[PDB]
Design a protein around this ligand. Structure first.
Ligand SMILES: CCCCCCCCCCCCCCCC(=O)O
Length: 216
């Protein structure tokens, strides 16, 4: 099977770890979530701060963490699953009162020659808060502290925050920031946290996150 949806299509019902082999890729073990709307590959999961997410480009490219716990699957693995296909990206957020927020967006994902850019249509960029986007859409590269794409020579978004992310601004979201259980001395620490601005605010540290992908 090339991905979790293929595993779903052959009849696999259980969520857990399964071997897949995308076109052109070696085989590798992924976390599949089997739902009534098909098979989803889990590409990121955070829930307790046990895994360090402040890593460089090569780690975000290859993947890191605990497949039975918190992890980042790895951009090269994710792009091997998506290829050039239109894909559903599910973003799941949990706050410290147990509320969950479930978002889904249609995306394309470029390969490493695009710095693994998230390619959004203008309506999808609008869903994310962008107001003036041309029909050609928006491309946002991935950035880490050692490979940051902020054009301002004065600035480095990943270094000023924490982790690796599609920093379209430095103020929209970062689900790969530093895990916090409480309010740090200043918004100076929470600035480097796990946030999604339009749900709980720029400096609310989220309790748990999951990101999932389903090509087509
Ligand atoms: C598309 C799925 C979401 C996950 C990745 C989102 C990364 C950011 C890309 C969206 C750019 C929107 C810019 C809004 C700017 C802002 O409010 O600061």
């Amino acid at each position: 099977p090339r991905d979790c949806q293929e595993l779903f299509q052959v009849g696999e019902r259980q969520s857990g770890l399964f071997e897949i082999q995308p076109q052109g890729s070696p085989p590798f073990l992924v976390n599949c979530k089997m739902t009534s709307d098909g098979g989803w590959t889990v590409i990121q999961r955070r829930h307790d701060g046990s895994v360090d997410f402040n890593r460089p480009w090569e780690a975000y490219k290859a993947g890191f963490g605990d497949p039975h716990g918190e992890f980042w699957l790895g951009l090269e693995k994710v792009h091997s699953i998506t290829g050039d296909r239109n894909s559903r990206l599910a973003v799941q957020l949990r706050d410290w009162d147990g509320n969950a927020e479930l978002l889904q967006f249609s995306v394309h994902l470029g390969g490493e020659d695009t710095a693994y850019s998230l390619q959004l249509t203008a309506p999808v960029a609008g869903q994310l808060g962008a107001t003036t986007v041309p029909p050609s859409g928006l491309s946002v590269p991935f950035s880490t502290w050692d490979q940051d794409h902020d054009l301002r020579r004065d600035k480095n978004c990943a270094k000023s925050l924490s982790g690796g992310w599609w920093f379209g601004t430095c103020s929209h979201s970062n689900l790969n920031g530093q895990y916090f259980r409480s309010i740090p001395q200043q918004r100076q620490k929470l600035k480097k946290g796990i946030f999604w601005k339009t749900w709980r605010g720029r400096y609310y540290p989220l309790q748990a996150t999951t990101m999932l992908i389903q090509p087509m």
